[PDB]
Amino acid sequence: LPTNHNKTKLLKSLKNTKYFQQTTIDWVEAGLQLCRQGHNMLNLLIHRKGLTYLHLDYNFNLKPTKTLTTKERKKSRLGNSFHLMRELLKMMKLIVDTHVQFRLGNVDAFQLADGIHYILNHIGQLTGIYRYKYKVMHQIRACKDLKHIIYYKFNKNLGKGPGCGFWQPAWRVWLNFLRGTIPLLERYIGNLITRQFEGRSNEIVKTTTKQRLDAYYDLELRNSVMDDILEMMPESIRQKKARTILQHLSEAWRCWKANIPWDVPGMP
Amino acid sequence: VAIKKPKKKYGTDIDYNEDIVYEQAPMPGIYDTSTEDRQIKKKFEQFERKVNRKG
């Protein structure tokens, strides 16, 4: 169920500032400008980090200019967020570039529709979003499945071949994907951009996953035993002995693992 | 020519000659203070001149 008190939207919260401005332009100009601006933003994300050797091509292919170090492979790997931006801009640039190849006069409108239906049913081949976000495969399977319906209702008396361009439901599937990963990418890129400007929160404290049952259980039991001895022992200020009684503890634990009777002479 | 200082390994690196390393002057008590801070500063400046001439 949608939220009922959602009076705030995104663009309606941006009209009410002095910075955004309303205008009416062609869709192709809006697409070319979002390609130019997406190239500028990803290029500046790259160039703020210092990754000046990653020549982000204008078709949003990230390619290293030269072969790298390992230090230039540690700073130059990026997460699912930056690459997910890069792959959605690959997808959108394929859309807008096929509309441009229409608008320039090169390609027909029928060949535009088949090119678009080729885009929206080969995102997993033309783009590479399946790598960095794998639930895209759901939508990719659905697009393939819509292909498998539409090519055998478009081609009853036509057999096999290109020419089909009923791109509407695969377009709906990718719009529903974008409906899902607007707030995902908002949170991911919000965290990335605040690491770029504000920086890493220095109190990263690690929760005990299955690598740290042993070590944190050791610290747990060790602190408990040392508090028990410091409670029990009379008037002794701890400098060095507090570190060493616990060794007897660990000695005893090895004596328990070896089943040797833990007999230490002079222990209270 | 003076001595190099060591490189700032991290952006907030502390150089321990300019300032007090962490100013933690004692909490103010009921006795008067300055008459022996003058003796401290005089003896420290005489030590500075002695390091200037002997080291």
Binding site: - | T12, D13, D19, V21, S34
Partner: protein, 242 residues
């Protein structure tokens, strides 16, 4: 959330002044911690925008305002009010300014008024040190001799300009000598008319010479070992005048 220290001189001669608060505006220029920054305009149509450049804790540690960076009570620099407190109490009250980043943050977060801030904080000890201050104040080229090192070049330009009605000048301070130069023929005649005469700047006497040679700075000396030696010989020549 403490309100800022902005004194009566930064805001200006208006009663209704509209400032703009930005929470966590910028790092302060003392301790590099962020703070709520207040920027405004002195008039409504002022061209200069005036913003607070220090945080509230760095303001109250020096007892200074956030905009003009002078004292809240006296509207004077920190170094000079510390010098005045050292003149009064015979105790070198200095403002210990940090230089390491962690030391800046550490020295701003602690609850103390460092430097000479405690004296000017309450008005009682302020007026006490004020009437102690009152108790203290109850207690065509030319050559120039006799310029002690506390005599700048700009005073030598200003007094010669004041005695005339208003032209370059060359003074070797390590040689303790001076020279003056211009182009107008009548200006030298008027300099002779408004007098080896004596220039009296601040009772410090400077003897004049009509210097027919065209002096460069090489005429005052080529090196620094010539300058001190010529200064000693010219002071002995002044003793020969006396």
């Amino acid at each position: 959330e403490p309100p800022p220290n902005i004194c009566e001189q930064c805001l200006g001669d208006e009663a209704n002044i509209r400032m703009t608060k930005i929470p966590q505006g910028s790092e302060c220029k003392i301790c590099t911690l962020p703070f709520t920054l207040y920027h405004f305009k002195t008039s409504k149509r002022s061209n200069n925008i005036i913003k607070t450049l220090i945080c509230v804790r760095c303001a109250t540690q020096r007892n200074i305002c956030q905009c003009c960076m002078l004292d809240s009570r006296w509207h004077i620099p920190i170094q000079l009010r510390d010098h005045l407190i050292s003149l009064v109490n015979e105790e070198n009250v200095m403002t210990e300014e940090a230089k390491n980043d962690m030391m800046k943050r550490f020295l701003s977060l602690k609850n103390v008024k460092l430097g000479g801030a405690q004296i000017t904080s309450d008005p009682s000890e302020a007026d006490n040190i004020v009437d102690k201050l009152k108790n203290i104040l109850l207690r065509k080229s030319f050559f120039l001799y006799n310029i002690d090192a506390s005599i700048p070049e700009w005073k030598i330009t200003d007094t010669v300009s004041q005695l005339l009605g208003i032209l370059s000048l060359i003074v070797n301070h390590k040689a303790k000598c001076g020279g003056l130069r211009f182009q107008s023929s009548e200006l030298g005649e008027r300099f002779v008319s408004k007098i080896r005469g004596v220039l009296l700047i601040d009772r410090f006497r400077i003897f004049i010479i009509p210097w027919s040679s065209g002096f460069s700075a090489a005429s005052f000396g080529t090196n620094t070992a010539e300058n001190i030696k010529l200064s000693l010989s010219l002071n002995k020549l002044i003793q020969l005048e006396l």
